[PDB]
Symmetry: T
Subunit: 137 residues, 12 copies
């Protein structure tokens, strides 16, 4: 019924970073989420402690999370441990294809405790992640 | 307009392997592909040489491929080299979450030369992969 | 009651490869298997897709497998995934002592999902593998 | 004519460790060894220095050894160097399937200087190891 | 005379994470610390920058620290560098046994610049850490 | 009610190795163990086979063990396998901070099958280990 | 015309950490920067999210950055990704010689996407970094 | 007198893959092989089992092989084991310079059991390989 | 029109090292190079600085190089950097099959910046390398 | 008062290698060194033995060295051992950013025994290195 | 004045292992040690606990040790820790050249805490080790 | 009858590097070599090409070599290949204990093709190496 979309560091910068901005991204998600009969609560923070607080809320609330954690994907165990609490499905999103880049990008602390992972499908990955969650209730 | 869905070894065995069989899988894909205005040509082979021949056809034809190559994902460079020819988008599909399993499963020769990757969303990954390709023409 | 003996690539070549040929090997197994009150269905293929099809049959049928997969032992995850289905015991056979050779030979994708492993006892390993299966029904 | 069965540390504890005890194990081996026309001299020690002294005796005497060295398998070069002297066949036995366990268990200092290796066939591995030695004189 | 107990990310969640909550934990520490003739100043933050500021205070003040840094243990050099300043003893605490879990958990940037480490003794580790500090003034 | 304190090689040498000797150590433990309402049975051996025999006794008896195995910590799988039998809690003790020394010292075969680990708190670690066991019956 | 000097965690502590404090450091930079005809905007934060926000400003503004990111150098991909946006030159500064210390300090996520790197020249590295930027406009 | 030229997977695709096709390649080899007084029997297959059967024929026949095994070079031990039988010279051919590409391409299971290796000289490598074999009878 | 053949350390010793000496080698190359319509300028030095000076000349002159750098192949980046300047083709020659020897021999700093590589074809590799260069002008 | 600038192999080639030649480089250094009140003695050699002899002179003389050792940076321990003697400061210079290139370039035997390191600031690094040495007497 | 020669496991077997036996070895050492004005106390044990007890005696007594620890060289930290106590010189002896054998033999826990090491000079290494100790008092 | 003592780079510097100089070293060797009935031809060079030329002479001449190759020990394959020619014994000498230093010092390309190795016995190692060669003719 409710989905939490959580974006980590440097995901404010889309565009600036042919560029669809985060404000547009929120717009998209929220539209494609109203057709699915869902509500999308989309947030972005550069602060790990903020991201954690949001994932705590989703844990207590048992609402599924769609998480594009940015560069913390590859480095953060604190984040992963907060994700591990979640009882509702967790879906890991990457806009770029990470496996086509630096080799250090090919490890994710989050993948192994997520339900599943979408990578390289761009902005639409978010929308697809939504559609998975709609069809699994 | 046309999408090639290609399944590698042991993907005949779905079910037998709560189990949705491959025949059902073909049924699904072909239905969700008719709503998208697409045609889905879905095949499965245990033979690498067959898989290659199908990817050659898709290369010459420039039709996008959705490829769940099975255990050849982790081992086959021949396959990857055949995928590399493709001019149309390539999407890598995994039913199980591979990153939640054996560590050797977390390397894919295909990922780095694919457009993108879906993992752990089950049978639906195929359907989502479709939807990406529809929205990108 | 029935045992499947499956030999992978280059195991046709025994002798040619002091040499007991595969035809002799089949002869042996089938004799020592009649004394044990068993039936031995012994096959050999250079084709992975064939090997898989045979292991599929043994999976559906729930008949134990004795598998000397050759050089695919060290490289094939597809094979291992097909072996993983088996409900009846799986025994991995190696004629040569693999640990006495190249270091890459000392990893087997099959070992960890087999019941057990015989290595370096030559042609007789097959016969011993039989005897294990007889005494465990 | 004579076979030395040598068990390393913690192999006294079988049972205690559905459990067939070492005393039963000795009983087994000695019975299945009388049918083969062999004599089985079965010993067990937690002391490496004792194990070595027994392998020295077998070296001087040129009597084949069946050796389940326990956790010293994975760690001991001293043992391996004592085994290296043997002129009669050496067979390495493991009750559990070692490759199905911790990854550190998948290296054996003994394997490369043994004639061959049996793993995961339980208590019977000893009996099979016997049968190899009978048929090779 | 004064001890600083510092808990890192996700240590607010004890219980929720049979569960003794952090508020209970603070209660414990502060009780067992009054019997030892000590004062326990116990804090928790998800923010690394906050944790650092607290460790700066303890550095300037030369008051011993008991630090359970959470998932930052395994990843943070910034934290370790702040701990390195401390002149009073530093004790690293882990509730779970970390060595019994994922292999990446078995490296701690903090251990080598701590006085010592307690792991897997649960909530009591904190109390024991206290008792070390009491007996060493 | 009874605790087994077991010290491995070179732990006789405390002092000789500002030095509190083992005889003093036994004295300590036995005093702090009488206040806790416990009995401490403290032994030390340079012989692995002896250490194993003591851990066998504790296994059969189901009495908790406090084990400082010395340099066998880092090398011995035989020891670890004997510790694995224990049903009562096992606590691993290190006097020095091992993580502050050679890098090879930072792996312990014992840690992952122990209840927990104390490191770098000196002689007192033993006393703290006691106190854990008292409070957990 | 304008240079951004950005210092990461624990760089407030210079001195306390023969010690020239950060306030002195700012004093220095700002003096040697007025002789070069430049303006130096020098900031320090323990918060990664703050550091990122400052690097975002420098990215949008296209003003060169001199960045001593502290312990986040060795661990942070989020930081590196924010640095990657910069169009103006980026210079990485280290006061201590990092290659003369722990081996983990010899990898920097920042180096490969920086213009260049100064290491071990102490406080003056900042001043030299300035002088590079003056001579390259 | 006779040379076997064997091409592995995806070597049908030359051109399609400035492009000289395989049919042209066969044409070349067969021309430059008639001047050398040789006969060239050139085949190509995507099927490993076919490649093996051809190498078996060359083994029995003791006719030298020129082998460009494609992506199976880097992955196949079965192939290597079939090549190992050959008594006549084996020459490994690569059109592209493999060492100038992905790092995984820089290991060949075939190289160590070949007579020698040609890499990066393009289509002509085949012709040079011929010329070696002519001058060595 | 002109080819530079450059041999590194210990290549004076051919023969001494069934042995064709370097003087013979020069003789060969110069003969097979006159039939190809080429001129071969063949040199050998044990001195890296000399080898570099010769490769500098070939760089300035834009004349192709055939380089058998000896043991500097596996160790020298200085050499590789000098080879990198060359605009004319560079061909790496090895008399022995290097991949059939020590594992450290299987890395070449030169391979990745060469046009191509010949290995294990003996003295003739030089002659083949010539023939490549003739046919590519 | 005197500074030794020492350039290793292939640093003669600047320009040839938009290009400022070594002769220009010497010109620069010597000018910017006269303003600093210093004398710059700048040399370049492709010969390691020459470089060593120059560093021996600087060692005996106790005059600081600025050393851009070229490709010997990454490979030479002999050089590093000669640098280790120096009592006056040693500064390591790299024109290119080495960390932005091949991964093997990111280890320097010299860095850990140098005072400090400048990398990627081009020709000016030399001038900055000078300025460090002037301000530190 | 007194030297302790200590031989580890399997060093009883010299000869049996052209063979000079240990009894001869003791004879040698004791003769060449009387000419040097020394006394040689030569012992051998397969038991680590015995070896340790002897090294404890040499530690307390401050008499130099010549130690050929056999296969415990490569595996034993307990031994190394006992050797670390010694105040008198420790010399590590190996009869065979260990670096010419298996790669695992090329690490010695003892080397780094020994005064020095002799390897591959056969039985005489002992005599040379003596001569070092004579000339260093 | 004749022994070649060859010292590599930076071994001129003994003393300067309590210091016995090389001139003294030559003096020593030549004295202790006259008592042994030998002649010692002792040379030192910083030039690898010189060292090689000397080892070539010893190869042709079949006179044993005592080689302390300095930092080229750890890096040079060219040297090792020149040493490999020698028919007379080769003894590797190190003054310092190399295993007590940097970890990169614990690999020697020379050790595996030497007769044996002396390390950490200082200047006397040379004299002992002599004595080995005297007693082995
Ligand atoms: O582009 C993405 O999807 C990505 O997850 C985001 C960031 C941050 O921009 C990067 O840190 C990741 O490597 C990739
Ligand atoms: O389940 C999947 O999606 C998967 O791609 C398929 C197979 C084959 O069943 C496995 O070989 C892969 O590891 C995972
Ligand atoms: O000899 C065997 O038992 C073996 O399994 C078979 C082959 C193929 O001959 C090899 O590929 C294996 O390494 C070993
Ligand atoms: O169970 C076995 O066969 C085994 O060899 C025995 C021990 C000791 O119980 C373990 O140390 C080995 O890992 C496995
Ligand atoms: O449970 C612990 O003691 C621990 O330190 C805490 C966290 C965070 O909950 C984890 O990140 C650590 O891996 C283990
Ligand atoms: O000091 C300890 O606590 C320790 O467990 C003991 C020994 C043996 O003295 C060492 O072998 C260990 O590395 C550390
Ligand atoms: O001293 C430095 O220049 C340095 O960049 C700073 C810190 C933080 O003090 C450390 O984290 C770095 O390793 C080194
Ligand atoms: O181009 C070649 O020579 C090559 O051997 C062929 C293929 C298959 O095209 C690739 O799989 C190899 O990496 C390189
Ligand atoms: O034999 C060769 O072709 C080779 O290039 C030459 C030398 C030097 O003899 C060796 O250093 C190389 O490993 C191999
Ligand atoms: O460009 C440099 O600064 C450098 O030190 C020089 C050389 C040699 O040109 C290269 O060998 C180094 O990798 C980088
Ligand atoms: O031969 C030796 O000198 C040696 O130290 C002894 C043994 C035991 O024989 C081996 O375990 C060592 O690897 C080598
Ligand atoms: O001191 C030695 O014996 C040594 O061989 C010599 C040098 C060069 O001084 C060093 O390069 C070696 O690491 C050690």
């Amino acid at each position: 019924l409710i989905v939490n979309v959580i974006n980590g560091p440097n995901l404010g910068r889309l565009g600036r970073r042919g560029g669809t901005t985060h404000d547009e991204l929120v717009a998209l998600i929220e539209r494609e989420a109203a057709e699915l009969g869902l509500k999308a609560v989309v947030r972005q923070s550069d602060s790990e402690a903020q991201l954690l607080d949001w994932i705590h809320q989703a844990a207590d609330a048992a609402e599924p999370v769609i998480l594009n954690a940015g560069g913390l994907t590859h480095t953060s165990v604190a984040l992963r441990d907060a994700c591990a609490e979640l009882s509702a499905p967790l879906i890991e999103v990457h806009i770029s294809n990470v496996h086509a880049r630096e080799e250090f990008r090919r490890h994710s602390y989050l993948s192994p405790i997520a339900t599943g992972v979408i990578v390289g499908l761009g902005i639409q990955g978010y929308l697809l992640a939504l559609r998975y969650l709609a069809e699994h209730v």
